[PDB]
Design a protein around this nucleic acid. Structure first.
Lengths: 71, 94, 110, 67
RNA sequence: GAGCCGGUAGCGGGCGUGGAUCCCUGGAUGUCCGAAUGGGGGAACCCGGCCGGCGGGAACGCCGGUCACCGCGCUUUUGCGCGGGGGGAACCUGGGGAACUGAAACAUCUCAGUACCCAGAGGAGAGGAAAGAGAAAUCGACUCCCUGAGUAGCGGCGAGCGAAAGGGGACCAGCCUAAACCGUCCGGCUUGUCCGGGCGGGGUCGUGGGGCCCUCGGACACCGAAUCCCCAGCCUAGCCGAAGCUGUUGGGAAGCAGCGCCAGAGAGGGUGAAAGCCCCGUAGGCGAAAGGUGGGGGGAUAGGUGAGGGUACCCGAGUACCCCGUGGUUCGUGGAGCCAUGGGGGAAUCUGGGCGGACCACCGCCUAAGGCUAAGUACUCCGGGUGACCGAUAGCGCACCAGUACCGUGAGGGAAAGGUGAAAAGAACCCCGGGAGGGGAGUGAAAUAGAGCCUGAAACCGUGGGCUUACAAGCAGUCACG
RNA sequence: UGAGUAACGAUAAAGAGGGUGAGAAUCCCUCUCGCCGUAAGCCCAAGGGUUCCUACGCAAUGGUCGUCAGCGUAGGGUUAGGCGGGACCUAAGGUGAAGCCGAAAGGCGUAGCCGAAGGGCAGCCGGUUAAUAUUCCGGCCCUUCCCGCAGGUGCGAUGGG
């Protein structure tokens, strides 16, 4: 495997759909977006001790970095 | 099982002429090494090995009628030692 | 009629045939039954060559195939086969007590 | 031969392990029969091969007795 | 139990009740191949090492072993034991993700998360211990059935798709992990007291546990692989086993006859023409031995639990809530529950925090966010059985030397043909003639059943005959007279 | 069915004798024509997997018989110290320890390797067989390489040149 969170995963199924709204207002327009898409996170690592990459993945890193820092 | 014998005699006019000089016509295993072909004739059969030649050959010609068939795997190997003997016990039919 | 079969080389009269009056069989055989009443040959005109007897319509032919023996001649004709008196160790013989009380036995015979 | 195996049952090492070689040869003889004899020999060729197996076998299977 | 040396009959022999065949079980070498593993490479080729062995010592080949590759187990001495990885008719779960068609347009919808493709999976899967549920102030894994209306439901309120609770019933089992909290021993850390390793305790079940004190505990609950044994059954091989003759035509009879029996077995199939009692090891019943496997039953194993009270407090993923995003669930934003996750921000310990019913309340229930979970439906490639289901251009396209030939480069698609006849006794010689062929014979109850053959028609080709027809126009033909 | 008409793979044409055999314009021999000849020649390399050779075989198939036959029945039969290739090489290309990427199967490719008429790399004539052959024999020939010997020596990795 590759581009999961590494601890975990964000390879989400991605469906994209909309159009135009006009509802609480009154009239109703047309739109519909019966289609599919994609939507995904971010790469970057640092250090164990000495000479190190890391990799892992996005959002957790703001948490994520400290744990290994916490060892 | 790694056994010495590797061959059966072949029967050409030339093979029949083979003994005038000492060429030796043998149906053989489809993977015998010349050295085996040496040694087989040796300790299994007792000579000073000299001169060897050998022929792989795919099988030749057949029918039955109702279906189809062609002759299975075959092979030849030839040789003649210096002393001029041996196999005189073995040329005997001709 | 498989690896298992029936009557030994045996001694037995038969019935339907156009010959009836049987006795010894000769050689029982495999899936096609194949045995010899040692009655009724034909000819087969075994070619002409001296490798054959020279002037054929050969004389020994014995393959009246069907099972039909009135089995064995102990003192009876046809019988059912019951089974065995055994007594002595590994004895069977499926000796036939039906009317007559014998197996056409290996002891007394074949 | 009711007891083809017994001597074969008896032999324990190379003495057979070589004997077979000669004993193999006895059958090496049998290919010589393009048309030199090949009469009653057709049995003689047959299950004489069979013993050899056991000669393999007993070697093997006593090499199994060995291991 | 005793005759055999596959389909195939010849041809040359043998071995044999001092079991060979045949079957059944474990044996032992199993060429090459392919995840593929010594190394590459056009599958069926090749090239070596590193040991020991043959060849005339080694220069030359043979032998057998060992020679990856991942990921783990760790033994963190270049490595050890050990892990997988291959598929395989279907099977379902994930992950992925399609139109035309249907809308008599069609882009929303639909069909439909179908089809397909991978991933994974085991003989089942998956789910499965309740942040239920919905309304009694319930129930208490779930799935499978059928019901539950296709009503309650959702929308270009077009065509549609389509529940759950409840109720019945099937099987009817539930427990493991993190909690500095303590001890522990161990690692780092550095002066101890941060984190990390194991071990104990706890590691929940429904609001409890953690700790101090007091009554406390004086044992039954058997394994949801806890373990093994035993009845454990298939596997295989089996053995029975009842009981008619005689007459008769008859090409042949077990039909007709006559007289007879049988039996917890008159299913069926077979023997030259129709057998309950001739044969079929036909079904009644019984075997079987050691294995090679395992639910029921059984036992021991029972890890693992098996009292309430007191003080306040340290306790199931930090990331749930919220916002914008799409997902599911019958739910296409309509006000939009829930569970899902997209991003975005971001709180806390049983004074919780979520719920059900936009939102608030109040009412009541529940205690979330680390996992294995059987037996229960499904599926039928394999085996066995079954038959108002089928007969040889039906049935798989395939019934016996085929999905092989053939064709199509390849991707593929995709043939035709069964039965002579009691058995072959399948035709010796005879003669015509090159031979095939044909006649005699004789064979056989039938060869006008003799091998392209049971029986064999259809048109289409002949003769043999019969009747008529050469000066007339006519689809055809029907009627009238000869 | 039309049809024994169309058709007969070429406008580059043989004849006759003699034999053979059941039976020959087509088959075997002789003889004379004819035609190629810048190929309808000899030769290797792809193609393919048997003919070729011998006997008998004639219905088959050869687009006609056909005693012939590349058709049949079975047998026959080609081997390399140096011919070609493989145990050497490596371009593109392919491959793939890394390395870095994909919903999932994937992506590329560092290093090396795989892969030719490329390159490097050890000869030739005659002779006899039914058939093959510069590998069979004869003559001649040079071969990387091993051991054993002499002799000299600075030697030693595809490492760097």
């Amino acid at each position: 495997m590759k581009e999961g969170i590494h601890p975990k995963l964000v390879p989400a199924r991605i469906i994209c759909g909309c159009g135009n709204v006009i509802e609480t207002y009154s009239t109703k327009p047309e739109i519909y977006v019966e289609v599919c898409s994609k939507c995904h996170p971010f790469y970057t690592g640092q250090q164990r001790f000495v000479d190190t990459e890391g990799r892992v993945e996005r959002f957790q890193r703001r948490y994520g970095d400290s744990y290994r820092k916490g060892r | 099982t790694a056994y010495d014998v590797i061959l059966a005699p072949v029967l050409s006019e030339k093979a029949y002429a083979g003994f005038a000089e000492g060429k030796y016509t043998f149906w053989v295993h489809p993977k015998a090494t010349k050295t085996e072909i040496k040694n087989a004739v040796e300790t299994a059969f007792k000579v000073k090995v000299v001169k060897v030649n050998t022929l792989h050959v795919r099988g030749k010609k057949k029918r039955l009628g109702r279906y189809l068939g062609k002759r299975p795997d075959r092979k030849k190997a030839i040789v003649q030692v210096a002393p001029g003997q041996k196999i005189e016990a073995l040329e005997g039919l001709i | 009629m498989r690896v298992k079969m029936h009557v030994k080389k045996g001694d037995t009269v038969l019935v339907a045939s156009g010959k009836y009056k049987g006795r010894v069989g000769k050689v029982k055989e495999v899936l096609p039954k194949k045995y010899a009443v040692i009655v009724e040959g034909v000819n087969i005109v075994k070619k002409a060559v001296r490798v054959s007897p020279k002037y054929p319509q050969g004389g020994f032919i014995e393959k009246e195939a069907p099972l039909h023996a009135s089995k064995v001649r102990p003192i009876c004709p046809a019988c059912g086969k019951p089974t065995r008196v055994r007594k002595k160790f590994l004895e069977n013989g499926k000796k036939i007590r039906v009317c007559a009380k014998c197996g056409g036995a290996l002891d007394t015979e074949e | 031969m009711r007891k083809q195996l017994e001597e074969a049952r008896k032999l324990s090492p190379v003495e057979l392990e070589k004997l077979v070689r000669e004993k193999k040869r006895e059958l090496m003889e049998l290919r010589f029969q393009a048309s030199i004899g090949q009469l009653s020999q057709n049995h003689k060729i047959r299950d004489l091969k069979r013993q050899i197996a056991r000669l393999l076998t007993v070697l093997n299977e006593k090499r199994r007795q060995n291991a």
